[PDB]
């Protein structure tokens, strides 16, 4: 069903200027149903003249990704490593023991990833606070997207690293991100600044519950210990297992200079093809508010991201606020519906 297949968009410069407006557009086009969409920026647009002046950028907390599992079901353990520079990381990534294997087509690289992901644990330069944009880039600036999510900082005064601020991810071959939705089931934006590609898997929001049931079947202890253990970002499930259990999904490869958008309650996972650098943050639309209200959060850990929905319900749903505070707001989410801002185009 292409209504739930990953869509790719090619905006003009005029269309590219207004970020939240374009997100509304792609939802008018049905892009949210896949849970993931690609946006190719116009060729004029550039975010950094050169990436050669960043070799002294420090990666404070590299993680080594140990993976244990079999038959398409794996668990990923992260090992913090001593801080290192982009320069040192690049050298280890482009190194012979951690560089991309030879391959002809993406299908072969994907096969090698799922065949060898438990061997030769890679190093992932993840969750680096910072941005590679220039102060003058006003379009699709991950540091200042200017969506309603900013109410958390502007009105509540709260700052959540990586959620309403940018994060950088330095990948090498075989580094991966496990199946998850975003914190508070928000949107996310991801730009591949440079380097080798990043491959993505996505499950349509309308089928996310199915994935959850599958995962809960395979890790009953983890499910018992936590209400939303997938938020631990440790669970890897291969496409062959998804296909075997009838979970709908799609795949897409993100190339340097390309944006990926993830949508609320869109489960995604993937892996990096080689040495690369990506910048990412979360964002919101009016549609997200109900998702935020209904998100099932991690119960077993302490420093977890929990956003008070009060400010959003007060401002955008005043007529439901009292009801919501009483615990009697029984709104059922329809994952096919576009955000209200898209009415312009429909």
């Amino acid at each position: 069903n292409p209504s739930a297949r990953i869509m790719t968009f090619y905006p003009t410069m005029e269309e590219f200027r207004n970020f939240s407006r374009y997100i509304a557009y792609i939802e008018s086009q049905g892009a949210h149903r896949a849970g993931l969409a690609k946006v190719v920026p116009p060729k004029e647009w550039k975010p950094r003249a050169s990436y050669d002046d960043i070799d002294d950028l420090v990666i404070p907390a590299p993680i080594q990704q140990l993976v244990t599992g079999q038959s398409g079901l794996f668990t990923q353990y992260n090992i913090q490593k001593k801080a290192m520079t982009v320069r040192e990381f690049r050298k280890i990534a482009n190194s012979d023991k951690y560089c991309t294997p030879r391959y002809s087509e993406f299908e072969e690289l994907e096969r090698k990833y799922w065949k060898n992901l438990t061997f030769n644990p890679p190093i992932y330069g993840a969750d680096v606070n910072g941005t590679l944009y220039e102060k003058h880039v006003d379009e699709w600036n991950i540091g200042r997207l200017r969506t309603i999510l900013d109410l958390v900082e502007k009105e509540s005064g709260i700052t959540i690293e990586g959620v309403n601020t940018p994060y950088l991810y330095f990948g090498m071959w075989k580094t991966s991100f496990a199946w998850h939705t975003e914190d508070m089931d928000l949107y996310s934006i991801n730009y591949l600044h440079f380097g080798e590609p990043k491959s993505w898997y996505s499950v349509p929001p309308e089928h996310g519950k199915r994935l959850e049931r599958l995962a809960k079947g395979f890790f009953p202890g983890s499910a018992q210990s936590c209400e939303a253990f997938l938020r631990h970002k440790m669970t890897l499930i291969s496409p062959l297992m998804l296909k075997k259990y009838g979970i709908p999904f799609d795949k897409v490869t993100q190339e340097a200079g390309e944006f990926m958008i993830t949508f609320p309650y869109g489960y995604h996972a993937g892996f990096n093809h080689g040495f690369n650098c990506a910048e990412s943050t979360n964002f919101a639309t009016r549609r997200w508010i109900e998702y935020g209200k209904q998100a099932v959060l991690c119960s077993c850990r302490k420093d977890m991201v929990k956003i008070s929905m009060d400010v959003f319900v007060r401002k955008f749903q005043p007529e439901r606020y009292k009801l919501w505070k009483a615990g009697k707001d029984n709104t059922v989410i329809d994952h096919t519906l576009p955000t209200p801002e898209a009415a312009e185009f429909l």
């Binding site: 993680i63 993840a126 969750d127 959540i160 690293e161 990586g162 994060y167 496990a178 631990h232 979360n282």
Partner: peptide, 6 residues
């Protein structure tokens, strides 16, 4: 607190 790879 913050977003993390876990």
């Amino acid at each position: 607190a913050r977003k993390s790879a876990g």
